[PDB]
């Protein structure tokens, strides 16, 4: 491939796509939570369910999306999905009857994001081979910037318009993504038979259970009997900025580690993520707690950004789409079941110091799993046993 030149506009499209998708998926939930803080709940336990249904629909639909990207092209899918998402976000403006809004926001939106998101990762590989880590790092950092700036963006520019009407504004971003999707240009379970890939997929899936809880459920602890001077917004924005920096750095470092050896980064990040969370209840000293949270933000980059390059390395470019699709398919149920499990474990034990103790087992187990991923040379050695 060109490995440069024109390939720097595709990064712009991918950054825009990821930023818009996740910015909407977080801002809509946050804004409805604010509205519920301002308005009555009359449905109550289902209204908060939307923010999880729509998110989970993205990952739970990827397995089928991978048979449209690989069967039509990285452009047509990435534009039709954006069009569907635009239509979904447009009709949501009407009266918010439970079932009607439920459908219009969980089956039109979210489902369209699944079509408009998986192609945003495949195409980059088709433009970078030796620098792909750098491109992925840049894209992840830009998407983090976009997400962290989006809810504030719509809030400030929203002009304090009512939620039902403000759904129309978000519709424009999907249309722009549809137009920007024009920039993309092309330059079954068979994949599971590769043991070296299936074991890695299992290792990633196991650590999902312990990734969402500490990364999202964190503020409850400082809201629960510990914090006296909270200013937690500072903590959250610090974690976001450090996650951006970590993603940017991890993108480049993978450029250095040759070939399959990259996976050792994932092991060293999973182990430290697991250990750190276990130290959050113990390192109560607010300065130390802030430092540990800062570390948590940095550890994020190695977790997510470096997954796509390793996926390309393991199976090459011709099967990157299917492998990534079936990897994202397995992270839906483990990821979406974590927060409820922690929030009911706090009830089982009655104090909110144990959720974190549960938050460190899944990722350490996953790290133990990844450490045994066979080397290509060793896998060949076993292959030499065929005779």
């Amino acid at each position, epitope marked *: 491939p060109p490995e440069g030149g024109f390939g720097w506009v595709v990064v712009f499209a991918a950054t825009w796509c990821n930023g818009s998708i996740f910015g909407i998926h977080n801002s809509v939930g946050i804004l409805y939570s604010m509205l519920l803080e301002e308005e009555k709940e009359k449905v109550e336990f289902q209204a908060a369910w939307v923010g999880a249904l729509a998110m989970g629909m993205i990952f739970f639909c990827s397995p089928i999306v991978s048979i449209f990207t690989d069967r039509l092209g990285c452009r047509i899918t990435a534009t039709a999905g954006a069009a569907v998402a635009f239509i979904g976000l447009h009709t949501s403006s009407f009266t918010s009857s439970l079932s009607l809004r439920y459908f219009t926001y969980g089956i039109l939106f979210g489902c369209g994001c699944s079509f408009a998101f998986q192609p945003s990762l495949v195409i980059l590989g088709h433009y970078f081979q030796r620098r792909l880590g750098l491109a992925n790092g840049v894209v992840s950092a830009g998407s983090s910037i976009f997400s962290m700036s989006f809810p504030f963006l719509i809030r400030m520019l929203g002009d304090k318009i009512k939620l039902a009407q403000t759904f129309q504004v978000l519709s424009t971003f999907m249309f722009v993504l549809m137009l920007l999707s024009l920039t993309y240009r092309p330059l079954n379970m068979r994949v599971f038979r590769q043991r070296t890939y299936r074991i890695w997929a299992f290792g990633i899936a196991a650590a999902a259970l312990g990734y969402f809880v500490p990364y999202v459920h964190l503020m409850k602890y400082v809201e629960e009997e510990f914090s006296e001077i909270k200013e937690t917004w500072v903590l959250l924005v610090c974690i976001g900025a450090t996650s951006g920096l970590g993603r940017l750095v991890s993108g480049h470092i993978s450029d250095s580690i040759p070939g399959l050896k990259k996976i050792y980064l994932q092991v060293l990040s999973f182990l430290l993520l697991g250990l750190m969370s276990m130290m959050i209840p113990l390192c109560r000293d607010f300065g130390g707690l802030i430092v540990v949270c800062l570390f948590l933000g940095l550890c994020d980059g190695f977790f997510i950004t470096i997954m796509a390059p390793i996926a390309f390395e393991l199976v090459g470019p011709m099967q990157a789409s299917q492998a990534i699709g079936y990897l994202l398919g397995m992270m839906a149920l483990p990821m979406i079941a974590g927060p409820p499990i922690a929030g009911l474990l706090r009830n089982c034990f009655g104090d909110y110091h144990v959720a974190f103790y549960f938050a460190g087992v899944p990722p350490i187990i996953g790290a133990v799993i990844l450490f045994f991923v066979p*080397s290509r*040379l060793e896998e060949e050695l076993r292959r030499r*046993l065929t*005779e």
Partner: nanobody
Amino acid sequence: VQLQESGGGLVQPGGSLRLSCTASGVTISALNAMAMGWYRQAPGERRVMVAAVSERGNAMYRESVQGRFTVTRDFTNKMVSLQMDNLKPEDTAVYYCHVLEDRVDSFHDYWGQGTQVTVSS
């Protein structure tokens, strides 16, 4: 690059044997990213691997010999060592020392002349 011939031995049942080989012309840097081991060819049997040691230092074994024969990398001397214990009459075979190289297209192979190993029945 070639592995010098070595090995062999006639032993009684239950006996032990020690073997090794030498790598000629290989640099220590070139030795890394490669694995070394041994192969077996019993009467009427095709040349099949016995047990080797990977680049990471661990060893993969064949079903019929795992837990019976042991080897080590000996990377320091650019050599390889093989040892045996509790040999039995059916263990007789011609053992060939082989070295596999890491190569992007396909792993490259070196192997010297093996020697006959027989256990008296």
